Structure formats: C-alpha cells, structure tokens
Design a protein around this ligand. Sequence first.
Ligand SMILES: O=C(c1ccc(N=[S@](=O)(F)N2Cc3cccnc3C2)cc1Cl)N1CCO[C@@H](c2ccccc2)C1
Ligand SMILES: O=C(c1ccc(N=[S@](=O)(F)N2Cc3cccnc3C2)cc1Cl)N1CCO[C@@H](c2ccccc2)C1
Ligand SMILES: O=C(c1ccc(N=[S@](=O)(F)N2Cc3cccnc3C2)cc1Cl)N1CCO[C@@H](c2ccccc2)C1
Ligand SMILES: *[C@@H]1O[C@H](CO)[C@@H](O[C@@H]2O[C@H](CO)[C@@H](O)[C@H](O)[C@H]2NC(C)=O)[C@H](O)[C@H]1NC(C)=O
Ligand SMILES: *[C@@H]1O[C@H](CO)[C@@H](O[C@@H]2O[C@H](CO)[C@@H](O)[C@H](O)[C@H]2NC(C)=O)[C@H](O)[C@H]1NC(C)=O
Ligand SMILES: *[C@@H]1O[C@H](CO)[C@@H](O[C@@H]2O[C@H](CO)[C@@H](O)[C@H](O)[C@H]2NC(C)=O)[C@H](O)[C@H]1NC(C)=O
Ligand SMILES: *[C@@H]1O[C@H](CO)[C@@H](O)[C@H](O)[C@H]1NC(C)=O
Ligand SMILES: *[C@@H]1O[C@H](CO)[C@@H](O)[C@H](O)[C@H]1NC(C)=O
Ligand SMILES: *[C@@H]1O[C@H](CO)[C@@H](O)[C@H](O)[C@H]1NC(C)=O
Ligand SMILES: *[C@@H]1O[C@H](CO)[C@@H](O)[C@H](O)[C@H]1NC(C)=O
Ligand SMILES: *[C@@H]1O[C@H](CO)[C@@H](O)[C@H](O)[C@H]1NC(C)=O
Ligand SMILES: *[C@@H]1O[C@H](CO)[C@@H](O)[C@H](O)[C@H]1NC(C)=O
Lengths: 171, 171, 171, 322, 322, 322
Amino acid sequence: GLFGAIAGFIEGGWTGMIDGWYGYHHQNEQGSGYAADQKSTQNAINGITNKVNTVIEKMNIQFTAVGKEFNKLEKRMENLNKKVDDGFLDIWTYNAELLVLLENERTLDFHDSNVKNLYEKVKSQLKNNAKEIGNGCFEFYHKCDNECMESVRNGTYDYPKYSEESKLNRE
Amino acid sequence: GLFGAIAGFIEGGWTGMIDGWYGYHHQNEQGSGYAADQKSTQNAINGITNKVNTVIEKMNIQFTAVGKEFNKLEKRMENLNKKVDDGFLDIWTYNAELLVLLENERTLDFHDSNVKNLYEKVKSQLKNNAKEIGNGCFEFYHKCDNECMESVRNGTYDYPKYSEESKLNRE
Amino acid sequence: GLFGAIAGFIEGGWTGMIDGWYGYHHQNEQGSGYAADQKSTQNAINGITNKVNTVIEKMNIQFTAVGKEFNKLEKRMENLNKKVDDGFLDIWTYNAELLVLLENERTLDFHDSNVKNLYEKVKSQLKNNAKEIGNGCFEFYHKCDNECMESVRNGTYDYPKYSEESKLNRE
Amino acid sequence: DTICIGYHANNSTDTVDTVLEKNVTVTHSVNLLEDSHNGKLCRLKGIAPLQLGKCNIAGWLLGNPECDPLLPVRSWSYIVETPNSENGICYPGDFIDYEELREQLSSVSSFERFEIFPKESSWPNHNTNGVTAACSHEGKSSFYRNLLWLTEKEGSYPKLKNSYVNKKGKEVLVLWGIHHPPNSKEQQNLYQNENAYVSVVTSNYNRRFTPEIAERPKVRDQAGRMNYYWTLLKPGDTIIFEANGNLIAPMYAFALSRGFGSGIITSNASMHECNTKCQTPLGAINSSLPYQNIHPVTIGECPKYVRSAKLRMVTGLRNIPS
Amino acid sequence: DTICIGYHANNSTDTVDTVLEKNVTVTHSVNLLEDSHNGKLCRLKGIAPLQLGKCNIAGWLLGNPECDPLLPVRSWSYIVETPNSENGICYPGDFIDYEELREQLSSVSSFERFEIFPKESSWPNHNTNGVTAACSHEGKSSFYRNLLWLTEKEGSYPKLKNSYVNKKGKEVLVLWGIHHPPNSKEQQNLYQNENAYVSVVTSNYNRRFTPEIAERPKVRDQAGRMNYYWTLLKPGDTIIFEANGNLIAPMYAFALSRGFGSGIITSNASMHECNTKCQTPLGAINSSLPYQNIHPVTIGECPKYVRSAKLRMVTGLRNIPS
Amino acid sequence: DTICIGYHANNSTDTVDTVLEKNVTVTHSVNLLEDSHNGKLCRLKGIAPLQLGKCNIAGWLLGNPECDPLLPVRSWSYIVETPNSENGICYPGDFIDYEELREQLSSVSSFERFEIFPKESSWPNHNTNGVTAACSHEGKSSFYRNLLWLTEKEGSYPKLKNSYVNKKGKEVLVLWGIHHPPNSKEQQNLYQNENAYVSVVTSNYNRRFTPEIAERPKVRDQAGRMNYYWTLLKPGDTIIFEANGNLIAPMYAFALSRGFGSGIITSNASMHECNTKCQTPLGAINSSLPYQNIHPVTIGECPKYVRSAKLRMVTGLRNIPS
Ligand SMILES: O=C(c1ccc(N=[S@](=O)(F)N2Cc3cccnc3C2)cc1Cl)N1CCO[C@@H](c2ccccc2)C1
Ligand SMILES: O=C(c1ccc(N=[S@](=O)(F)N2Cc3cccnc3C2)cc1Cl)N1CCO[C@@H](c2ccccc2)C1
Ligand SMILES: O=C(c1ccc(N=[S@](=O)(F)N2Cc3cccnc3C2)cc1Cl)N1CCO[C@@H](c2ccccc2)C1
Ligand SMILES: *[C@@H]1O[C@H](CO)[C@@H](O[C@@H]2O[C@H](CO)[C@@H](O)[C@H](O)[C@H]2NC(C)=O)[C@H](O)[C@H]1NC(C)=O
Ligand SMILES: *[C@@H]1O[C@H](CO)[C@@H](O[C@@H]2O[C@H](CO)[C@@H](O)[C@H](O)[C@H]2NC(C)=O)[C@H](O)[C@H]1NC(C)=O
Ligand SMILES: *[C@@H]1O[C@H](CO)[C@@H](O[C@@H]2O[C@H](CO)[C@@H](O)[C@H](O)[C@H]2NC(C)=O)[C@H](O)[C@H]1NC(C)=O
Ligand SMILES: *[C@@H]1O[C@H](CO)[C@@H](O)[C@H](O)[C@H]1NC(C)=O
Ligand SMILES: *[C@@H]1O[C@H](CO)[C@@H](O)[C@H](O)[C@H]1NC(C)=O
Ligand SMILES: *[C@@H]1O[C@H](CO)[C@@H](O)[C@H](O)[C@H]1NC(C)=O
Ligand SMILES: *[C@@H]1O[C@H](CO)[C@@H](O)[C@H](O)[C@H]1NC(C)=O
Ligand SMILES: *[C@@H]1O[C@H](CO)[C@@H](O)[C@H](O)[C@H]1NC(C)=O
Ligand SMILES: *[C@@H]1O[C@H](CO)[C@@H](O)[C@H](O)[C@H]1NC(C)=O
C-alpha cells in the first residue's frame, strides 16, 4: 500500500462486497448494506483493461522461426546462429519478466490511489456534518437514510440540510 | 489523476493562467488576478527537461547501417542476416514505445503530485485563518490584500496577524 | 519528494537518528530522544532488499563469450558477427542504465510514501488531543511521558485518557 | 449511524510477484504465459504437413528405396523429419551444399515429381540396371528411385550428351551423382575410359566433375564413394549432361512452387485430424496469449517463446479477507 | 475574499498515449520520431557520393562500355547504385567472390584508375583487338574498358608471363577474367593450345585456372562463358600473370584508399546541391530527434530506425479548458 | 511537550541519478557495475590455461621449431595467445580452414601429442631429412616438429601408401602439408614425377592434391609454397595417405578431449598462482555484481559486460543533514 490505504488504515477487504473493487458500507435505523461506486470502479476496469491490452499489443505475433543446419566445417556460422538465437531469447525473457513486475507494482499502487481519492471525495463532501471514526469509516452526528446514503455515494450530499442538526448534536 | 487533484476535485484548468503550469487565483476588494508559483513550476520544468534529455541521451546515434548481398548458395547467411536485422528492429521498436508510455504515465502523475503538494503547503500555511470552500479554493474569514496575497504565494503568510480577527469572524 | 514530505514540509533529516530510516523525536519534562519505527523501517528494508535482489537475479550469469576469427574473404561474416556483438551490447547497456534510473525514482518516491503514511498514522491516532505545529511535529495540549511516547510510537495511543484534559487546555 | 468506504475481497488464491514483494495474493489476475499444447501434429491454416517418415530430406530427394514412396504431387505448410532419420544417403559420399538445399526447401510449398530423363529412351548404348547392397530394398540390392547408375554396355561407355528444357513454369530441382571407384580396375570395368569426366551446364550453373580413384575405408561395405549434386533450373532454361563415365544420371526431378511461413522441424509427435494457427515440435498451441514456454521452434502465428516459469499480471487488488 | 490554487490549460490539441489511457489531450508535448526528409541525395559531411548511374559495382569495376566513364580519380562518402542496374556483367559467367568485393568497397573512400598493363607494350606476340556483341557500345561490338581479350596472333599464342609491382603506397585492386569456349574448335582458333592454363600469384594469392569446354545454353547470344576474378595487391607486393590461353588480361586497375562510415545503397533519388549528417535511400534527415521511421538504411549519424507510427512524450499536464 | 516524526540522515557523500534529477546525494546505496580486476591470468575452477608463449595456434599445431615444446599431454580451461604472435606459419602458404580449426579447439579440453607415423619405420625408400631456412632454429635450417618433408632417395620417389587406425577412443587431429615448388626443375629434383598427386581419405574425408608450379614472389626467401590441411579422424576410423610427391607427411598428431566453457583469448597478462570463476584478457574478476565494464571477452561465470561508467542504485533516502 504505497498510499497507506490498502493493507494500511483500512486493514481488510469486504468479502461481502461482490459487485465492484471499491464502494460503500452503510448502517442506519433502516438497516445495513454494501454498494460499489460504479464510476471509480468502471474507470479502474477501463484503465487495467487498457494496460493488459497494451502489454499484449506490444508483444507482436512470432512468425515461423526454425533451426538451421551446418556441416562439419561451418562450426563458426553454427555458433554465430546460436549466439543470435540465445541472445534474442535472453533479452525477451528479461523484457517480459520486468514489464509484469513493474506494471504489477504500478497496478497495486493505482488501486491504493483510487481508494484514497474516493475516501477524500466523500470525507470532503460530508465535511464537519460527520466525524472520521477510524478504519475509513465516518460516524454521522445526524440521522442518515437510503435517500441520504444514495445522495452521498453518487456525490450529491447536502451540508445546509444537516448543518444546524449536526452542530446541536456535535457540542 | 493518480493523486485525485488534476481532473479530480479541481475539475478544470485555467486558460487565463498563461505564465506557468501551477499557481494562484486571488479575488479581494482590490480585484482579481492569476500568478504562477515560479519555484514549483521552474522545478517541474527542470525535472521534465532532464527526463526528455535522459530519453534522448540514452538513444545513441545510429552509425552507417546498410544491406549486405548474398549469392544463390548463401541463403542461410542471408536468412541469418535478416533474422539479426529484424530481431534488433523488433526489440528497439518495443523499447521505444513502452519507454514513452511508462514515462508519460509517470509524467502526468508527477504534475498531479506538484498540485497536491502546493495546495497542502498553502492550506497548512493559512491553517484555520481561512476555510477550504471546495475545488481547491479557500474563503478567508478576514480581509486579504496584494501584500497578503503576495505573502501567501511565496510561502511567507502570518497567522498571529489575523488569528484574533478570523476567530471573531468564524464564530 | 513526489509526496511533498522528504525535502518538502520536513526540510531536513535527523543525523542524530542512526538506528533506522524513519521514526520519532520526543521532548517532554523527563527529556528528549530519537527512536526508529522498526515495523515501517524493517518493511522498507525488506522491500528494497527484495528490489536489489530482483535486479541482480534477472541479470543472469554471462558464460564464456569470446572473439571469432575470419579470413581475408569472410569480411561479410566478420561484419555480421560484429553487428551481432555490437547490437547485443547496445541493448544491454541501455536496459541496465534505464532500469537503475527508473527504480531509483520509484525508490525515493517509496521512502516519501513511508514518511507520509507514518505521519498520517500517528496524527490520526493523536487526533485533536494534540495540534500539528509544522515540520511534521505535534505540540501536545497535555503532559506526555516515556509510557505515553512508547504507546504512541508502537500505535497504542489512548484518546479517552487525555480527551477531557486536552479540551480544558485547548480552549 | 456510520458510513464506510472499503474495497473488494474474495476467495482468490492467485499469487503474483512485484518488484518490492512476492507471493502477493490478489483478488483478480490474468496469465500471459501459454504452457498448454495438444501434443499432436496438426494441419496449419487448412494445409497438412509433409511427413518424411523413415526418411530425411536426403533420403527423400534421392529416393532411398527403404522409404515408402510419397504421391507424385504434394503441398504442405511445413516439413516433418523424425528423430529416427534411419534412411538418408544409402551409398556413401558427400551431399554437396546439403544445408543450402534444406534452406531452399524451407520456402517450398509443393512439388511435382516427374520423369526428367525417361529410363528406356534417354540413355542409348549404356546399361541402366546398376544396383548396390548399400541401397538395399527387402533384402535385395537396389538403387535410388530418382537416379540411374549408367555403366558400360557390351564393353563400351559411349560419350553421352542429353539436355532437358524446363517448360513446367516452375523452378525444377535436378539432382545427380558422381561415382568414385576405389581402384583403376573397377573404373575400367564400369566406364572403360580411365580418364573420364562429367559436365553439367545451365545458363547460371557450370561444373565439371573428374573421378578421384583411391582405396578408402569401407562405409556400408563400399570402399567407393558417390557425391551428390543439385541445381534449380529456372523456368524456360535448359540443363545439359555430358559424360564419358561416372555419371549417376537424373531420372526423376521436382517442379517446385514457393510459399510463405514454412520450415523443417523434427518431431516425435503423430499427425491427427486437427487444425491450428501455431505448431511446435511438441504439439499445437491454441492461444491469444503473448508468451509461451512450450518450445522455441514455431510454425505459423505463435506466442513469443521465453524461458519463464510464470508470467502473471495483477488486475485486482491485494486480497485481504481478514 | 477567496484564494484558489489551480493549473495551466491552453488551446492545445496535441494527444499522447499512456499505459492506463490513450488519446489523452495535453497542454505541452514533444515529438521524438523523425518522419521528415528532403527526398534528395546530398553530400555527407562535405563529401559527395559516387553515382554509378546506368552501372552496378560489377559493370563499373570491369568497365562495361555502355556505362559513361567516371573520372580517373574520385572520393566519396557512400556509393549509389540505381534500381535500374541495366549494365553489369555483359559477357556471361560468374563474378567470383562478388559479394565479398562489394563488402570490401563499403570501406573504400577513393580510387585511382591507372594503366596496370599498358595495351601496346605489355602483351607482345598476342592480338589485343578481341571484342564481342555481348558487350555492345553504340551498336558496335566492344569489350570491357579495364580488361583485354588476348587471342592468337599469326596462328600462335606464345606462353606469356607479366608482373606488376605495387609502388602506389595503397592496396591495388586487380581484376582479370578466364574465357571458357563452348567447343574444342573455338579453343584451337583463339589460343591454339588445347590444354591451356592461367596462373595468377602474389605473396598471399595463388590460383591456377584451366578452361572447361562444353556446349552451354546461349546467354546474351554466347554459349561460351567468362569467369571474373579479383585480388587486393598489398603495397610493395608483386602480381604475376602466366598464361598459354584463355586469360582476359588486366589493363586498368584501382589504387584504393580506406575510410570510415561508408556503404552501398540503392536509390531512385537525384543528387542535389545539399549537405547532410544523415542520408537514407529516400532522402536526407536534418534532425536532433532520437528515432525515425523513414528508412532502416542509413549513412552517417542518424536517428535509430523503428516501425512506430508516432512516439510523442507528454511534458505538460492533462489539458482541461472546461 | 512536542512529538516529531522524521527520517535518517548521515555523513554519506554517495550520489545517484534518477530520471527527473541527477547528482542526488543519498544516505545508502549499492554499486552494481564491477570495474575491479587483479590484472593476472588465473586458473579457472582449478584448471590452468594453455599458454602458447611465442606461438599462435598455427605455430603450435604444426610445431614451429622457434616455439618452446609443450608437454606431450596437457589440459586447460582456456587458451592464451599473446599479442606478440611471432612464430606461426614458418614456410609460406595457406592454412586451409584455419579459422574453423580454431573454433574446433575452443571446445577442446585436453590433447595427447603422439607419434602417428614414426619417422624411422613409416616411410621406406624416401628421404625424411628435408629442412628449410624459412623454419630456422638457433640459426640452423630446421622444420616443423609434427610434419616430415619427404623427398627423393637415390633418384627415386616411390609411390607411398600408409594408413593409421584411431584406437585412442578420442577424435584424432591429423595435419599434413602439400609443397608447391616454384619451377619444374625443383619438382623433378625433389619428387622425380613431374605429374605427382597426393590423396588423403577417411570415412568422411576425401581430397586429392595436385601441385601448382609457378614463379611466385619471395616470402621468407621462398618462391615455393606449402599448403596446410587437417581433419578430425573419428574414434575407430582409418586415415590413408597416398602420394608420389609433394606430401609433407604427418609425424605427430593430437588425441583431443572435448569440454565445456572454453575459448581462445589474446592477453598481455602473466600467469600467477591464483584461481577464479571469471577471467578476462585484462585480469580475473571476483564479484557477485551483475554488470562489469572491464572487458567484453569473458571466460567462466562473469558479470554481463556494458559500456556504462557507473551503475549505482539508491537504497536509502535523499540525504539532507541540514
Ligand atoms: O480483474 C479483472 C480483469 C481480468 C483480466 C483482464 N484482462 S483482459 O482485458 F480480459 N485481457 C486479457 C486478455 C488475454 C487474451 C486476449 N485478450 C485479453 C484481454 C482485465 C480485467 Cl479488468 N476483472 C474482470 C473484470 O471485472 C473485475 C471485477 C471487479 C470487481 C469485482 C469482480 C470482478 C475483475
Ligand atoms: O512543456 C514544455 C517542454 C517541451 C519540450 C521539452 N523538451 S526539451 O527539453 F526542449 N528537449 C526536447 C529536445 C529535442 C531535441 C533536442 N533537444 C531537446 C530538449 C521540455 C519542456 Cl519543459 N514546455 C517548454 C517550457 O515551458 C513549458 C510551459 C509551462 C507553462 C506555460 C507555458 C509553457 C512548456
Ligand atoms: O540501504 C541499505 C541497503 C544497501 C544494500 C542493499 N543491497 S543488498 O540486499 F545487500 N543486495 C546487494 C548485493 C550485491 C551482491 C549480492 N547480493 C546483494 C544483496 C540493501 C539495503 Cl537495505 N542498508 C543496509 C541495511 O540497513 C540500511 C540502514 C537503514 C537505516 C540506518 C542504517 C542503515 C542501509
Ligand atoms: C505463498 O503464501 C501462501 C500463504 O497463504 C502459501 O500457501 C499456503 O501455505 C500455508 C503454510 O502454512 C498452508 O497452511 C496453506 O494450506 C497453503 N494454502 C494454499 C491454498 O496454498 C504458499 O505456500 C506460499 N508459496 C510460496 C512459493 O511462498
Ligand atoms: C481523440 O479525441 C478527440 C476529442 O476532442 C477527437 O477529435 C475531435 O473529435 C470530435 C468528435 O465528435 C469532433 O467534434 C472534433 O471536431 C474533433 N476535433 C479535433 C480538433 O480533432 C479525435 O477524433 C480522437 N481521436 C482518436 C484517434 O480517438
Ligand atoms: C555533485 O554535487 C556535490 C555537491 O555537494 C559536488 O561536491 C562538492 O562540490 C562543492 C562545490 O562548491 C565543493 O565545495 C565540495 O567540496 C564538494 N564536496 C565533495 C565531498 O565532493 C560535486 O562536485 C557535484 N558533482 C557533479 C558531477 O555535479
Ligand atoms: C471460490 O468461489 C466461487 C464462487 O462462485 C466458487 O464457485 C469456487 O469453487 C470457489 N473456490 C475456488 C478455489 O475457486
Ligand atoms: C481455441 O480456444 C478457444 C478459447 O477462446 C476455444 O473457444 C476454441 O474452441 C479453441 N479451438 C479452436 C480450434 O479455436
Ligand atoms: C493556439 O493559440 C496560439 C496563441 O498564440 C495561436 O497563435 C494559435 O494559432 C492557436 N491555434 C493553434 C491550432 O495553435
Ligand atoms: C536543420 O534544422 C535546424 C533546426 O534547428 C535548422 O535551423 C537548420 O537551418 C537546418 N538545416 C541545416 C543544414 O542544419
Ligand atoms: C562517515 O562516518 C563514519 C561513522 O562510522 C566514519 O567512520 C567515516 O570515516 C565517516 N567518513 C566517511 C567519508 O565515510
Ligand atoms: C572474493 O571476494 C569476497 C568478497 O565477499 C572475499 O571475501 C573473498 O576472499 C575473495 N576471494 C575469493 C577467492 O573468493
């Protein structure tokens, strides 16, 4: 977790959340439930899908590549041919292995980025109308409902509506 | 936007700001204007200019490289020569294309870094003497002027000067 | 400093701190001292040690590689052999140089990550029971001791214990 | 009431490596390294390969009698020799520019085997019955099906001259041989002329062959030697044979068509009723994967061969069902 | 009052690709892939190329009469043949080690063409008038300008022996030829000695040539053949010719100087009054760019050739004028 | 009271480069580019190299008298020639397939030098005393130690025929020579037969040699020439020599053992009592480092050679003791 979110201040994942990589858990008078943020999740899928496609597109089809034969008196050309085959293979193995390692690091860091950015977006939206209560959770100073929860998840949360009530409650 | 600033909580760029990549917009009794942060901008130019130079320096001049000819009975050496020319070209095309792709990703992320770092620097400087009012903007709880604005842009902002006044104003 | 911590809002390193890359400085009634965070530091060592090992493991042993000789009438095969030797060497020099450059950038950014993540962990732990006083330092609104300092460094800091006292003190 | 933001986990056991860490368990991932093949020789893009069976290019083109006779006309996507190359050269000597001819065949898409110099008509006043125990067939002494051992007839080897004009509209591969007796008595018996020569000529081929007489060590019971030669006769061009001894005359030759993406491979594997875009000596690959560790020898449109044991790229996140 | 931090945007339409995205519009960017050339052959670092015109290396060095005669002394940065290699070998046969001689010429920076064996003095008691319709000039039968067809004079071909000592202080390229008549009557007529030979010797070259008589198919109306040979005579070394027939004698040879960074290219393009650091068969490149997709064939100090359509690196930020 | 989080600094002066910056001073770092060697030739994995001294492969295998004689049996990890290759071919001519023989020796791990054809018994009715000033030893005319100059005895050169059977259980490298006199009188004097030949045969080698008589320029005072030939006689196989002149007969030959990871290098450096896993022409490397800029020529298990001046990877952080 390069950005300290994944395997950081949010210690675990939610096995209960099966419909996307990132999203929300709500608990209110009416009950509790999970829901993926489709915008941030779908964009994350598009990016990763574009990155896999990029790796494959850049590795072009290998066409027919076969052994050559050399007589008792062509040991140098045989050796030269081997040096060329071995050399290319050394290079391609190395290129392939590092590219997956580098991109994997970049990938995990990318998911960590998406979690930090979504948390900050909701936190900055909710502002002082709720308190950060650890492990990426907010505890409301006011009553929240399905309408309230749906408005926050899709980035349409209102401060004036609950500003007075929270202030009375927060003391 | 890996750090959620560019095309994130700051939805757009300022076409009006022509004198640098990052900087400030002020609005006060005396008027409104844009100004680039030269320190963060110039450092960003130096870095990017060093990165372009690095890519070019590492790709060394190609010296004379020409076709060879082979007789009716040298088909193997002709094929071997082609395998070597084709092989090197496959490798160099791949190396060139990925390097620009990787560095471009790293570049955009780098600019995103510079915006987050400058915002946090001014926010932490201004502290509770102003409120964060969304889209990377602060609304002052006190009167600010050209002297005030110039002192904040270059990282010389005073808290005690406005601490009492803001506190009375912030309620 | 991609994350604005190292050579950023924390302007310098602590030469006095010899027992790890990151950790804590405390100043209280009983005195002052430095101590490395072993968890974040050891994990940082493991990562970097795994990254150096990765670079070396991927560069496989070179086996016997020697010159060939060609007669007055084998100038083409001599030239072809040179093109193959020169070509491979051009490629490997480039691969080696960029890999250290890319990983070095990723390395510095990684250390910057570890500092931001540890600061946020303690800040979010201490919460409003202390104030952020610049240059990555907190000034307590209450008395702190060796037990208090040891509890904060290893992530076992209590809010209720000092919540009333700080509140009276913070005004 | 409380509201929380968090991330997906599941039952995934998939592991990947990064630069900083390894054996990292992840929610979702994709394999890039193809390691599965079907262990069969298959048709390539609809076209079957040429299976030489108990024969090697040398045995096939000379027509070693021990090799089951192929059709007079065939097409192929690639050529398969077996590791058990049991029937090749049967009469000992050198196959001149053999490796170059194999390379030529690597770009050949079909052949017509045809009677370039008919056995009955082409060689008046010479015997054509010559056989040898070195080129055995069902225990009886025999000879190459595509060459003819010309020897003396009624104590005379008249100087011969024969030419063929290529009206096939394809390159014609002509093979022939030169026999080198171990001693001057055998030379006398077979060809009568102690100072014999052979000449072969086209528009772009010109070579004279003179026998070299010496007691050599026995190879397949022969102290004598036979050198084998070939050329590609361009469409419309003429080949001329002159000899007063020692010529192993062409009888059958091959009209060659050129194609793309072919080669010669050696394989233990069996032809099955299957079709592939990618063939290796071990078996066919059916994959959109970029890399493979099955075999470096490929026919068709294949993944790039690498030595890697695993190449797995992460798509999901660190899987922590805690 | 309010204070805001934000970032530059402008009217930029430039697009780049990243790993995660593509067609990303950016404020500022730099092109790394040079695709522009001037479509001309130019001088390289002040030195003009050698244009062979209607000739190929073979036609030029033998001196095919159909080829306009070059100056006796020239220098060049590279050699240009044209796709229309109309005049090469005019009398049919093989140019032995032709490809090796081209490779030798790739590192040659100048030549002096000089009279190695003067026509009048060098060959007493032989005719030097020999010409052929295969090497035509303005409709009249002619011959190579740098070789001499020695034939019988007054029914005799005396054994000849001539040597030249290299006092030029440069490698001297000597060429010569061996004529192979189609039949024993022509051999008799031209050289009288039915069993002729040719010998050529230096300190490090030794080869004997014997004619090979046979009716070959007509090529440019000749059943006969001419094989062409060459060697590099080291400074101070001696070349000796002995023959009693069939020698196509050297008349003119070339004192060669070696240089760096040269080669042979084939080009449709025309020489213009221009100067470049980088030449391709399509045209010259004037670029500090690291990569180019113009041509893989380069002379001088060029960008590395790649197959890419675009290589654009971002320097500014995501351009969002919203 | 105040509590602070911060990071390590120290007295480190180490600098590294990144993509964005350079000359960045860092707390801790590791060098990956090995540039240190000991300037000695050393044993490789316990086995000493073969030092040819004043000799080159050619001088050694022919046995040039000026070269100090090696033991009759040796083993090595690699072969060292010196830049001062002063003693090679002593009698002028061509060493046929010389480069191919060097490549063969690159995979040879030991030899036994043995008397293939004993001087006294093997060549009845021929003189074996032949020496030359071209192959001088301590001012006296001498000859190659491993070859024998057969000439006339009492005005006769009888046709000779000798064969050796390889019962060594190793490939046997046999060398021999063919002498080409400058004129017909010397041919007569040395071998009597004006039309001499030499034949050499095995199961897979067959070649006839005929002398080529001509006045050549003097090389080491000889107008004559000597061509040198070799073959690898398979275990159990027989080599047969026939000649009626001009044969420079084998006397000593080499039983060769094949090994892994050997080669031939040229080095100014001296053998010392040391042992290494990695040898270069400049000296031995003792390193677990992945890269080296010492030399591209390597024996053993070495770092990959690169042109880089520095390859330093950062492990600590930006060092700021401010
Ligand atoms: O992680 C992945 C994934 C897995 C593989 C992949 N690679 S592909 O785009 F399919 N790429 C692989 C491949 C191989 C061969 C040819 N073409 C292709 C195209 C792309 C992605 Cl997002 N997925 C599939 C999409 O949905 C993701 C998901 C997210 C949350 C909850 C449950 C599933 C999980
Ligand atoms: O984005 C760039 C830019 C564009 C190209 C570049 N590459 S170079 O350093 F010029 N590199 C390119 C090149 C090519 C060939 C030879 N040498 C070189 C040197 C470096 C940079 Cl910062 N710029 C130029 C500097 O100013 C930047 C800017 C910033 C804000 C507002 C207006 C302009 C915009
Ligand atoms: O920065 C490093 C460092 C230095 C080199 C290194 N590379 S190795 O893992 F030793 N790698 C280098 C090498 C070379 C050859 C063969 N095997 C290897 C293994 C790994 C690390 Cl963490 N260190 C060593 C560990 O302790 C770090 C440290 C941290 C804080 C205060 C004082 C020291 C400083
Ligand atoms: C990678 O890590 C996993 C840890 O989950 C290893 O897998 C398991 O190992 C533990 C060892 O105590 C067993 O109890 C589990 O039954 C294993 N589970 C599964 C599903 O494999 C694995 O061995 C590690 N591999 C490597 C190469 O380090
Ligand atoms: C890349 O994206 C840009 C989007 O701005 C495309 O350019 C334009 O496409 C829209 C399509 O509705 C037109 O209305 C504009 O006139 C276009 N403007 C310019 C200046 O080009 C572009 O087609 C896209 N290209 C690719 C390859 O995807
Ligand atoms: C890299 O930077 C360092 C800066 O510390 C240079 O080293 C020193 O240069 C200053 C120049 O005023 C001297 O006063 C110091 O005595 C130097 N100290 C040491 C320990 O070297 C160094 O020259 C720079 N190198 C490059 C290549 O830019
Ligand atoms: C994991 O979960 C899926 C849920 O659909 C289940 O079908 C599968 O069998 C489980 N186990 C493994 C090893 O995939
Ligand atoms: C090849 O693999 C694909 C997997 O997508 C499969 O659907 C197909 O049936 C397989 N066989 C052929 C001949 O394509
Ligand atoms: C973009 O803006 C510049 C401003 O100087 C202008 O000159 C230019 O013509 C504009 N359009 C394009 C396509 O560059
Ligand atoms: C080459 O390009 C540069 C661009 O910087 C230009 O100034 C110069 O005039 C061009 N021509 C030559 C011959 O350098
Ligand atoms: C740096 O510090 C160490 C402390 O142990 C010291 O021994 C060393 O000599 C110092 N100087 C240098 C250049 O390493
Ligand atoms: C080689 O280098 C190592 C450094 O780890 C050293 O300990 C060893 O003594 C050196 N010599 C040999 C022969 O290994």
